[PDB]
Design a protein around this ligand. Structure first.
Ligand SMILES: N[C@@H](Cc1cc(-c2ccc(Cl)cc2Cl)cc(CP(=O)(O)O)c1O)C(=O)O
Ligand SMILES: *[C@@H]1O[C@H](CO)[C@@H](O)[C@H](O)[C@H]1NC(C)=O
Ligand SMILES: *[C@@H]1O[C@H](CO)[C@@H](O)[C@H](O)[C@H]1NC(C)=O
Lengths: 42, 286, 372, 50, 49
């Protein structure tokens, strides 16, 4: 009623989370550059 | 004594297909493109409140090298590079995890455990084994109310004399084999390419016989009994049977070897070729 | 009624006698009384009872059962026979069953059928908690890869300096860098000059990272090792004629005052004396205090160890394999001399073996579930 | 440096070993499990009386 | 710097001024190596499904 196996890279879909966080960081980088182009105003 | 089994056993060679095995052929290129993506994003991110330099920095950390002189001089590029490095950690970490989990799990198939073993529980043609003809073994396999299913499976491949069977299985022609114990026990401890399951199978015992009511029986019967307190047969054992030694030494996970790591070694040749190209191309570009 | 072969239990009062597939056995008891003994002792079942009941049902003869009141597996007491076999020299009974051995002194008067369950003086051992190798840290890689690594180092250093000649990086600094990089890391050092030659150390670093990863992966296997069962041949072993090759803790288990003793004081007597302080009270204390290092190797008759193994909760109690035993004898059945049943019970018990049933019986009582 | 690499690596490997086999005993596999066939005093199992 | 240390390594800086900052970052890097190791192990736990 049970056994175990070892996948191969285990997915692309299982790994997708890392690219999710990658894109999120890229977006925050963009918005922060914009906010810097803003806050030189001070 | 009783009956046992016999099958070849050896050090496995569980091996990876290639150093690139634990990934698919796609993600390998996904990361390769994404690294340049985030590099040029750095290049167009820091330049406003160093091209090849940022290229080097970006493409290095995936190698844990020491190469790289520049750095981000902005704030946003810093907040990017941090997560970039974290990703660089996760990639190689998952790689190690996967390769390990692979090489610990793949311990090769079990040995033939016994009469009730699944891997031979049914008669099967992808797993062929024989027995001894005209002998006590197919005698005891005659009256097999249940075992008849494998009884026929054997009697369709029966064998005649031991020199057939041992020499054959040594040559990996067959898979398994059966006999009485003492013969195969000795044959195992003599040359150490074969082992037994050690599982007893059906009790019996040799002896001596004469035509009925011959006047000897009592004398020989008391003689033999005399020959098991003084341990004379204990000595006969060491004289002939428990004669040698080959250690058990449960096998290992079969070290990687000179075999397939040359998949990696294929890299230095590509390095040399690319270098002898790039030197002339650099002369030109200079 | 000694072993788990011949058990007896209290008479069932709820439905008369025993209510389940056994035969009664009586007990005529008088001691320190003039009067008459006798009363129905108990219902009376067991392995030996099983073989007796079946064999009688098959060879068509009927019987009854009362126990021994004075004696045991008897010996020569003033040139006589008391107890079990004594009840057969006196012709006060016809046959003897139950756990009973076979020797000469008993083969003199009564006669013995072909034995069924094997037996003999054996040993008891215990496993060992893991055997992590001493030279582990050099196992998981072949002999090739290391010198191959070294020569790749050399050739890469050569091509490095030579593509470089198109403070000053040379053989020493380069080889040092390369070593310190292929091993995890160390010692901030000078880099190579020239944008182009950087490619080489790069791909080398790729090689190195995959290398270290693969290596720790593989070596993560040689720490998972299976249970190690010790090894020892029959009692003709270097490990026991000269037991001081290592520490005296290597204690030997043999209960005194019995067949083990007598069959021992006849051939060596030196193991006999050396086992002087290493005496043990029966099987209870033995198979308890053996698990905790106070008792390590054992000496007894296998037909009890090969039973007691499959009962202990643990799994560290396994005998050595068969075909390495001392006193090759067998339990059997005892009958009056030269009667007319030796032949018939012989044929029928060999029939019992030939048809494959004793395996089922041993499965019912003798062997347990705790196969190793 | 090589010795440093070896010590760190062996540390990682040993920890990897000890975590993989950190999983409890198997669920009672039925009416024929060892831990239930022959009794013991660690974990008991019974029913309602009568 | 200290972020570039838990995750493996990059970005050459020293902060080498007075040897006591050195004895400070030392214990930090130590904790780092043991952390990374523990992670690799217990993640190789899950890749077996
Ligand atoms: N076999 C002998 C008597 C005899 C019986 C046993 C024994 C003990 C417990 C159990 Cl459960 C079963 C048995 Cl068979 C053991 C020994 C061994 P020792 O010599 O150390 O007393 C022995 O002699 C006979 O029938 O003449
Ligand atoms: C063997 O390992 C088990 C694991 O729990 C432990 O309980 C036992 O005490 C150890 N015994 C010895 C002799 O190492
Ligand atoms: C066993 O025998 C020895 C010597 O033969 C004797 O000293 C000892 O008292 C005996 N023990 C029992 C329980 O009979």
């Amino acid at each position: 009623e049970k056994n175990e196996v070892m996948s191969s890279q285990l997915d692309i879909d299982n790994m997708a989370g890392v690219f999710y966080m990658l894109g999120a960081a890229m977006a925050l980088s963009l918005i922060t550059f914009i906010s810097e182009h803003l806050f030189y105003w001070q | 004594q009783g009956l046992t089994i016999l099958v070849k056993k050896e050090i496995p060679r569980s091996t990876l297909d290639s150093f690139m095995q634990p990934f698919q052929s796609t993600l390998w290129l996904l990361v390769g493109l994404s690294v340049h993506v985030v590099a040029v994003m750095l290049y167009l991110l820091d330049r406003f409140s160093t091209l090849s330099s940022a290229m080097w920095f970006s493409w290095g950390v995936l190698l844990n090298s020491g190469i790289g002189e520049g750095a981000p001089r902005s704030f946003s590029a810093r907040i990017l590079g941090m997560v970039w490095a974290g990703f660089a950690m996760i990639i190689v970490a998952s790689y190690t995890a996967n390769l390990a989990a692979f090489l610990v799990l793949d311990r090769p198939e079990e040995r033939i455990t016994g009469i009730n073993d699944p891997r031979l529980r049914n008669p099967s043609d992808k797993f062929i084994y024989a027995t001894v003809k005209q002998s006590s073994v197919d005698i005891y396999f005659r009256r097999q109310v249940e075992l008849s299913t494998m009884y026929r499976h054997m009697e369709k491949h029966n064998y005649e004399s031991a020199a057939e069977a041992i020499q054959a299985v040594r040559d990996n022609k067959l898979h398994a084999f059966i006999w009485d114990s003492a013969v195969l026990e000795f044959e195992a401890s003599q040359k150490c390419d074969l082992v037994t399951t050690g599982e007893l199978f059906f009790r019996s015992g040799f002896g001596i016989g004469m035509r009925k009511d011959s006047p000897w029986k009592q004398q020989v019967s008391l003689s033999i009994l005399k020959s098991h307190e003084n341990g004379f047969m204990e000595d006969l054992d060491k004289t002939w049977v428990r004669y040698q030694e080959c250690d058990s030494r449960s096998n290992a996970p079969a070290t990687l070897t000179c075999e397939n790591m040359a998949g990696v070694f294929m890299l230095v040749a590509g390095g040399i070729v690319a270098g002898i190209f790039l030197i002339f191309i650099e002369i030109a570009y200079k | 009624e000694e072993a788990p072969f011949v058990i007896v239990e209290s008479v069932d009062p709820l439905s008369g006698t025993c209510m389940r597939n056994t035969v009664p056995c009586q007990k005529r008891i008088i001691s320190e009384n003039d009067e008459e003994p006798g009363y129905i002792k108990k219902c009376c079942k067991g392995f030996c009872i099983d073989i007796l009941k079946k064999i009688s049902k098959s060879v068509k003869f009927t019987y009854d059962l009362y126990l021994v009141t004075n004696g045991k597996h008897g010996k020569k007491i003033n040139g006589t026979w008391n107890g079990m076999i004594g009840e057969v020299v006196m012709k006060r009974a016809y046959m003897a069953v139950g756990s009973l051995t076979i020797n000469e002194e008993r083969s003199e008067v009564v006669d013995f059928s072909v034995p069924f369950i094997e037996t003999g003086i054996s040993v008891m051992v215990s496993r060992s908690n893991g055997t992590v190798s001493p030279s582990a840290f050099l196992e998981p890689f072949s002999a090739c890869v290391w010198v191959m690594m070294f020569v790749m180092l050399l050739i890469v250093s050569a091509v490095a300096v030579f593509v470089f000649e198109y403070p000053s990086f040379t053989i020493g600094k380069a080889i040092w860098l390369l070593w310190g990089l292929v091993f995890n890391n160390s010692v901030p050092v000078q880099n190579p000059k020239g944008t182009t030659s950087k490619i080489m150390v790069s791909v080398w670093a790729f090689f190195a990272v995959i290398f270290l990863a693969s290596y720790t992966a593989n070596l993560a296997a040689f720490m998972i090792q299976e249970e190690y069962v010790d090894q020892v041949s029959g009692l003709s072993d270097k490990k026991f004629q000269r037991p001081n090759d290592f520490s005296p803790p290597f204690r030997f288990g043999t209960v005194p005052n019995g067949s083990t003793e007598r069959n021992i004081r006849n051939n060596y007597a030196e193991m006999h004396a050396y086992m002087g302080k290493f005496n043990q009270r029966g099987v209870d204390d033995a198979l308890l205090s053996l698990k905790t290092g106070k008792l390590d190797a054992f000496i007894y008759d296998a037909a009890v160890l090969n039973y007691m193994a499959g009962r202990d909760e643990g799994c560290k109690l396994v005998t050595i394999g068969s075909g390495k035993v001392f006193a090759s004898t067998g339990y059997g059945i005892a009958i009056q001399k030269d009667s007319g049943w030796k032949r018939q019970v012989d044929l029928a018990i060999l029939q019992l073996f030939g048809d494959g049933e004793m395996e089922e019986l041993e499965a019912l009582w003798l062997t347990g579930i705790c196969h190793n």
